[PDB]
Amino acid sequence: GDDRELAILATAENLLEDRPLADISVDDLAKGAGISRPTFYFYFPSKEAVLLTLLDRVVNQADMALQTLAENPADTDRENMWRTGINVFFETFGSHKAVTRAGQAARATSVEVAELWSTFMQKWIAYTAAVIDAERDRGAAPRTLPAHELATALNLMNERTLFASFAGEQPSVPEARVLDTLVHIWVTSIYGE
Amino acid sequence: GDDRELAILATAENLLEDRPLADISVDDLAKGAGISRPTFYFYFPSKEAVLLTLLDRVVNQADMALQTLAENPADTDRENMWRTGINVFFETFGSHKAVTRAGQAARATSVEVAELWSTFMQKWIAYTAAVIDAERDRGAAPRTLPAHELATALNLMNERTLFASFAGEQPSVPEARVLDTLVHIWVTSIYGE
Numbered sequence A, B: 001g002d003d004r005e006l007a008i009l010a011t012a013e014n015l016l017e018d019r020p021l022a023d024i025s026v027d028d029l030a031k032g033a034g035i036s037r038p039t040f041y042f043y044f045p046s047k048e049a050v051l052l053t054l055l056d057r058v059v060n061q062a063d064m065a066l067q068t069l070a071e072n073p074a075d076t077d078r079e080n081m082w083r084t085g086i087n088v089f090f091e092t093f094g095s096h097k098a099v100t101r102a103g104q105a106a107r108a109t110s111v112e113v114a115e116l117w118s119t120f121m122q123k124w125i126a127y128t129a130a131v132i133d134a135e136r137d138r139g140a141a142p143r144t145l146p147a148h149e150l151a152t153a154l155n156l157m158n159e160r161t162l163f164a165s166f167a168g169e170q171p172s173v174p175e176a177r178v179l180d181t182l183v184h185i186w187v188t189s190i191y192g193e
Ligand SMILES: CC1CCN(C(=O)NCc2ccccc2)CC1
Pocket: A082, A085, A086, A087, A089, A124, A125, A127, A128, A131, A155, A156, A158, A159, A162
C-alpha cells in the first residue's frame, strides 16, 4: 500500500543522487519501485509530485527535530545553543543532499514547492526572532536591529551558504567549515553592539 | 550598428520588467528594437544570449563601481566603509531588478550565466577577504574565522538577501531595511570576538 509509496519515494531519492529530475522518467521510478507505470500513477500524479513529497518529508523532519530541541534545552553557553540549532539543519538537509538540491531547483518551476519552502522559512524565522527577543528580554543580547529582520537575513544566509556547500558550488565554504562559519556570524551579530 | 545592439538590449530589459524571458520571443525583441527577426540573429544567436549580455553589463558595472571605490577610499569609520561598499551592489543591482532576477534564474539553465556569476563572486569574495586581512594586519579587527571563509558566507548572505528583497519574496527583508540589516551583520562579524 504505502509500502509501494515508500518504495517509489526511496527509488526517487536514490536516482536523484545520480541525475536531475528532468533525466528521471516515471518509467524509471516505476521500474525501481517494482510496479507498472499505471500503478505508479495511482500513488502520484507526476514525478514532480514525488519530489514535492520527498521535500515535504525532509523539511518536516528538520522542523520536528527543531521542535524537540526547543522543548529540551541543551545545557550550555549561548554559542553552543545556536550551534545545536543550526546543526539540526546541517545534519537533516546534509543527510538528504540530492532531495535538498532538487527541491531548491524546483522552487523556480513549482508553486507548491515554493509555497512549501516559504511556509517553513517563515516558521523558522519567526522562531529565530522569538529566541533573539527572549535573549534581549533576559539582558543577554543588546537591542540592535529589529529581531525579525536580523532573523530573516541570518536564515537566508544559512539557506544559501549551507546549500552552496552541499552542492560544492564555486564559490562555497567547505562543508567541514560551514557550521563553525555560520555559528560565528550568528553569535557576533546577535550578541554584538 | 551597435545602435541596433543597444536597442535590442534596451528592449529586452524593458520587456523583462513585465514578464520572464520564457514569455519573450525573438520576434518581440526584434519588433521592439525596430528590426526583423533575421536582422536580430545577426547581433545575437538567441534571446538567452541577450540576457547573458545584459547580465554581463550589470555585473561589470557593479565591479567597475567597486574598483572606483577601492582606488578612492571614503573618509569615514569602519561601519560607513562597509556600508559604502555593500551600497555599490544594492544600487547597481537595485537599479536593474528585472535583469538581476532573470539572470539569477538563468544560472540553473545556462552554463555561461553560472560561470559569469561564479567568476565575479570569486572576485568579490577575494576582495572582501583582502580587506578583512588588511583590517586584521592594522590591528582594527580580531583574528577569528579564516578571512576567506567569513567573506564567502557574508557574500552569499548578501546575494540571497538582496535578491530576495528586490524580488519581494516571502520571506524577505524589506528593501528600505536591507542595507542597514546587512551592514550590521558585516560589522559585528568582522570586528566582533
Ligand atoms: C533556532 C534556529 C536555528 C538556526 N536555523 C537555521 O539554520 N536556519 C534555518 C535554515 C533556513 C534555511 C535553510 C537551512 C536552515 C533556524 C532556527
